[PDB]
């Protein structure tokens, strides 16, 4: 936005403006060139829901339960860029660089904390049509990397590419032919890459600034903790902004 | 603090009552232990 660029760093810091997306003014149309490229795509989640079996009035349907963020204002992706490829009919976007991941922890009713890497990493997003419109819909799959890298050590000093490979505080478990096979899933730290799905939807286009902006809805899986727990499905909604060039 | 209380009495338990109560608590413990342990 032009308003945010008018401010100093000292006027913004502490206020929480730096975690917000820019709002776009106007309904116009942008037709992307062959060398077109989204540059500073901001993606701000504003709602978080984790799927869990709930006991509503008499049955046990699956519901996305609204959850509260506890990692305070670190969740918004920004500076996402990548070329806009014009196909025969449709317009596609392949994100390449930028801060395209944000570790977020939400808390479920009951005290259950659900960490997840909110990401758009390796997003290939197919659109409908050839120009950016106030009814344009872009969407596609992305790759969710594992929330912990293989360098992450657990409380007992075990990790994927570093660490102990045994429960080292229980040395008598390494005895007999079976060994520590009952503790294999906790000693074997596995880097897992899952898939997520985001559906963006442009509703405001500023042609003089070459800026688009609308809403999205994304679903992905949460942290598996190196393959030690079963991940939960996390549904998120919010606002995005981008500049088209 | 108000005055010294004039209702203050002494408490007694003679040796017979001690043996009767020690027997009662041990026998109730003997009786009910098998049920508590289940």
């Amino acid at each position: 936005k032009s308003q945010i660029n008018e401010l100093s760093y000292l006027q913004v810091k502490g206020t929480g403006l730096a975690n917000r997306c820019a709002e776009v003014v106007g309904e116009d149309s942008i037709k992307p060139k062959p060398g077109a490229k989204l540059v500073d795509m901001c993606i701000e989640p504003k709602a978080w829901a984790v799927e869990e079996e709930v006991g509503k009035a008499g049955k046990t349907e699956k519901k996305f339960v609204n959850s509260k963020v506890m990692t305070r204002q670190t969740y918004t992706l920004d500076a996402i860029e990548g070329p806009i490829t014009v196909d025969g009919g449709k317009i596609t976007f392949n994100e390449k660089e930028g801060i395209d991941y944000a570790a977020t922890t939400v808390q479920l009713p009951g005290g259950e904390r659900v960490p997840f890497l909110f990401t758009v990493k390796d997003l290939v997003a197919k659109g409908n049509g050839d120009t950016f419109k106030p009814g344009f819909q872009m969407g596609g799959d992305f790759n969710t990397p594992s929330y912990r890298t293989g360098l992450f050590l657990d409380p007992k000093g075990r990790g994927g590419t570093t660490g102990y490979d045994m429960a080292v505080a229980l040395p008598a478990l390494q005895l007999g032919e079976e060994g520590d096979a009952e503790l294999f899933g906790e000693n074997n730290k596995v880097f897992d890459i899952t898939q997520g799905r985001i559906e963006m939807e442009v509703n405001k286009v500023n042609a003089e600034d070459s800026e688009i902006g609308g809403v999205f809805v994304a679903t992905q899986l949460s942290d598996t903790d190196m393959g030690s727990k079963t991940p939960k499905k996390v549904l998120t909604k919010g606002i995005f902004y981008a500049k088209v060039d | 603090m108000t005055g010294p209380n004039p209702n203050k009495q002494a408490v007694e338990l003679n040796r017979t009552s001690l043996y009767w109560g020690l027997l009662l608590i041990f026998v109730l413990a003997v009786l009910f232990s098998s049920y508590f342990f289940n």
Partner: protein, 42 residues
């Protein structure tokens, strides 16, 4: 396999009411010794 809370229920259910009665008997004899007036009263 027996219930593990029953070890607490039996042993505290024995000892605490038994030591209450041992407490009551001992202070009865100490009160008689104090009123007797000799060598045990102090």
């Amino acid at each position: 396999e027996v219930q593990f809370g029953a070890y607490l229920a039996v042993l505290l259910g024995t000892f605490l009411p038994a030591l209450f009665l041992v407490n009551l008997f001992i202070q009865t004899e100490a009160r008689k010794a104090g009123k007797a007036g000799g060598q045990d009263s102090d």
